């Protein structure tokens, strides 16, 4: 037997071997594009959770074979209602590893290579190896980080972008019966940093409310988790709250009801306690399937130039009937991440606050360094202290350099 049985790729070939009226301008039919897909196109899937499993199936059945997966998580029982590449026996094993295992077994000659890592563990060298990158993660930080990484791979010769250095980034997200998908062509279209409004950071209750004006069950649970557990140390000095530890949640649940009684707040339940502690986002298989399908279809289009790619940002909502909405996000010219020209601040804790509390730069814990000397940092307890003196050594044109956990890049601002 040969690798590919009769008619195996019949459902894919038709879009590569036939000319068409809606084809991509640079598209030419060929009985050799499928080969590039099977033999050389390298695709990296960021995330083995939710979209990840769906994404590996999609690419595999679309003719991709050189696929890599990155994930730092272990299989959890709650993954099982939608992460179909894992079974109860797999609970505890690395998702990345199990995803490749299952995929390689189900799709005959696929070659999914796993990586029990977080995306921050790798550098340029690792990512340049890929033609396309599909991210199906859930944290905004990761999305921004990988967004910065690909931007960094860009090579401009005299202000003339080198197309070969562009690594398309397909990004997808889900939330219950809502989801989003988007195509980012680093240096050509809107990047993640260009549309921060589209990525509203998760809820983070205000201190005053949590510590002195609780009104909702969630505030109580939050208080116990964020203040009482650190103060008291229920399970021993240094013992960190383990959101998955049954005993820890029962503890949090009891102290929560305690605070709720004192303020006559109803609703503290074990389920709600788990929700808050783990900052759980409801999820189902169907919504992940829909969004991963849009994303994979776009990865396919970008690889074979079969059709022009999603302009750039699609939204899906399944609540009242269903619909998809697509629009073109605009590349912001004043972009901190993808613009080519350094930022222009016009003014120490004046910039650290500006770089944090702003909306254009929602940096989380920026480390500011003057031309050639660390001014402030935060990554070192002495740095955050010794250097802390925030307390009002620069001039006019000086080129400052910020650094956050949000990007692999050093945003140059003047």
């Amino acid at each position: 037997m040969k690798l590919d049985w009769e008619g195996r790729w019949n459902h894919v070939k038709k879009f590569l071997e036939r000319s068409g009226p809606f084809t991509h301008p640079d598209f030419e039919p060929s009985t050799e594009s499928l080969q590039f897909l099977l033999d050389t196109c390298k695709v990296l899937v960021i995330g083995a959770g939710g979209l990840g499993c769906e994404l590996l199936k999609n690419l595999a059945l679309s003719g991709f074979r050189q696929i890599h997966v990155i994930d730092m998580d272990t299989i959890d029982v709650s993954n099982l209602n939608r992460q179909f590449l894992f079974r109860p026996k797999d609970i505890g094993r690395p998702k990345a590893e199990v995803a490749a295992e299952f995929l390689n077994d189900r799709v005959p000659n696929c070659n999914v290579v796993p990586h029990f890592n977080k995306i921050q563990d790798f550098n340029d060298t690792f990512y340049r190896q890929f033609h396309i990158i599909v991210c199906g993660l859930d944290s905004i930080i990761a999305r921004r980080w990988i967004n910065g990484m690909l931007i960094s791979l860009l090579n401009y010769e005299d202000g003339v972008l080198d197309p070969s250095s562009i690594v398309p980034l397909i990004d997808g997200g889900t939330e219950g019966f809502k989801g989003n998908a988007r195509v980012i062509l680093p240096g050509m279209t809107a990047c993640i940093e260009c549309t921060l409004e589209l990525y509203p950071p998760q809820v983070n209750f205000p201190m005053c409310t949590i510590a002195s004006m609780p009104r909702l069950p969630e505030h109580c649970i939050e208080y116990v988790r964020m203040l009482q557990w650190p103060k008291e140390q229920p399970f021993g000095e240094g013992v960190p709250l383990d959101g998955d530890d049954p005993e820890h949640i029962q503890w949090i649940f009891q102290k929560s009801l305690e605070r709720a009684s004192q303020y006559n707040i109803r609703g503290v339940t074990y389920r709600l306690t788990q929700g808050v502690v783990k900052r759980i986002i409801p999820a189902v298989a169907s919504t992940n399937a829909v969004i991963a399908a849009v994303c994979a279809t776009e990865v396919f289009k970008i690889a074979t130039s079969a059709y022009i790619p999603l302009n750039n940002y699609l939204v899906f909502n399944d609540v009242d009937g269903l619909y998809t909405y697509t629009f073109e996000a605009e590349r912001k010219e004043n972009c901190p991440a993808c613009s080519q020209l350094p930022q222009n601040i016009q003014f120490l804790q004046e910039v650290l606050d500006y770089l944090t509390n702003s909306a254009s730069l929602q940096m989380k814990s920026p480390a500011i360094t003057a031309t050639n000397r660390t001014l402030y940092l935060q990554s070192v307890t002495s740095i955050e202290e010794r250097t802390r003196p925030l307390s009002k050594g620069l001039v006019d044109g000086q080129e400052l350099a910020v650094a956050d956990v949000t990007t692999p890049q050093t945003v140059l601002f003047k």
């Binding site: 301008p25 640079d26 050389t40 390298k42 190896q129 398309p168 050509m188 690889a303 130039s305």
Partner: peptide
Amino acid sequence: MIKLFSLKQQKKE
């Protein structure tokens, strides 16, 4: 999109 994009169907350097 001002300029159209096409992926080279060759291996990277």
